[PDB]
Amino acid sequence: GDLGNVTADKDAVADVSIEDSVISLSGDHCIIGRTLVVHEKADDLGKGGNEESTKTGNAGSRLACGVIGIAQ
Amino acid sequence: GDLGNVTADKDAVADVSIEDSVISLSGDHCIIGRTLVVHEKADDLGKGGNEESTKTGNAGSRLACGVIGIAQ
Amino acid sequence: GDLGNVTADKDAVADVSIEDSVISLSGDHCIIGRTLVVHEKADDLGKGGNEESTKTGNAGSRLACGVIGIAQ
């Protein structure tokens, strides 16, 4: 362990995500993303069972809408 | 372990994702992504069973809509 | 282990993804992605069984719509 690491002894589920990025825009007189009409609808309506022993590390959907940098 | 690593002793599920990126735009008088009309609909409505012992590391959909850099 | 690596002792499922990218746009007076009308519909409505012991590392669909760099 030096920056974060699951270390279980029976079951280790994870969603390790180490997205180290760098973005260096420049230049002038430039439009980026004039109009955006977005309709994200991540409407989780799941269901479980009489013994469903889920062990999810991340139980959800990632919905992104960008113009330059989408690190997902 | 030095930057994050599942190390279970029975079962180790994971979604390791180490997307280290670099983006260097430049130039001038330039449009990027004028109009966007997006309709993401990641509507999870799953179902489980009477003994479904799921062990997902990441139970979700990634929906992206970018113009330059999509690191998924 | 130095940057993240499943090391189970019975079962190790994974979705290792190390997409290290570099993008260097340039030039001027240039359009990139004028109009986009996207309709992502990753509508997971699966189903499980009376003993379905799933062990997925990443149970989801990646839906991207970019113009320059799609590292999936």
Residue numbers in the entry:
A (entry chain C), B (entry chain B), C (entry chain A): 82 to 153
What text does the study give?
We unambiguously constructed a structural model of G93A fibrils comprising a C-terminal segment (residues 82–153) at 3.09 Å and of D101N fibrils comprising a C-terminal segment (residues 95–153) at 2.92 Å. 3D maps of the G93A fibril and the D101N fibril revealed a single protofilament intertwined into a left-handed helix, with fibril core widths of ~8.1 nm and ~6.3 nm and helical pitches of 240.6 nm and 65.8 nm, respectively. The subunits within the G93A protofilament and the D101N protofilament stacked along the fibril axis with helical rises of 4.88 Å and 4.82 Å and twists of −0.73° and −2.63°, respectively. The G93A fibril core features a very compact and serpentine fold containing four β-strands stabilized by two hydrophobic cavities, whereas the D101N fibril core features a less compact fold and displays a totally different serpentine fold containing four β-strands stabilized by a hydrophobic cavity. The hydrophobic side chains of Ile104, Leu106, Ile113, Leu117, Val119, Ala123, Leu144, Ala145, Val148, Ile149, Ile151, and Ala152 are located in the interior of the G93A fibril to form a stable hydrophobic core. The hydrophobic side chains of Leu84, Val87, Ala89, Ala93, Ala95, Val97, and Ile99 are located in the interior of the G93A fibril to form the second hydrophobic cavity. In sharp contrast, the hydrophilic side chains of Asp96, Ser98, Glu100, Asn139, Arg143, and Gln153 are located in the interior of the G93A fibril and form a hydrophilic cavity. Importantly, Asp96 and Arg143 form a salt bridge with a distance of 2.7 Å to stabilize the G93A fibril core, whereas Asp132 and Arg143 form a salt bridge with a distance of 2.9 Å to stabilize the D101N fibril core. Two pairs of amino acids (Asn139 and Arg143 and Gln153 and Arg143) form two hydrogen bonds to stabilize the G93A fibril core, whereas three pairs of amino acids (Asn101 and Lys136, Cys111 and Gln153, and Asn139 and Ser105) form four hydrogen bonds to stabilize the D101N fibril core.
Approximately 2–6% of ALS cases are caused by mutations in the antioxidant enzyme Cu, Zn-superoxide dismutase (SOD1). In contrast, wild-type-like mutants, such as A4V, D90A, G93A, D101G, and D101N, retain most of their physiological activities similar to those of wild-type SOD1. Here, we report the cryo-EM−determined atomic structures of homogeneous amyloid fibrils assembled in vitro from apo, reduced forms of the ALS-causing SOD1 mutants G93A and D101N. The AFM images, cryo-EM micrographs, and two-dimensional (2D) class average images using RELION3.1 revealed that both G93A and D101N self-assembled amyloid fibrils made of a single protofilament with a left-handed helical twist.
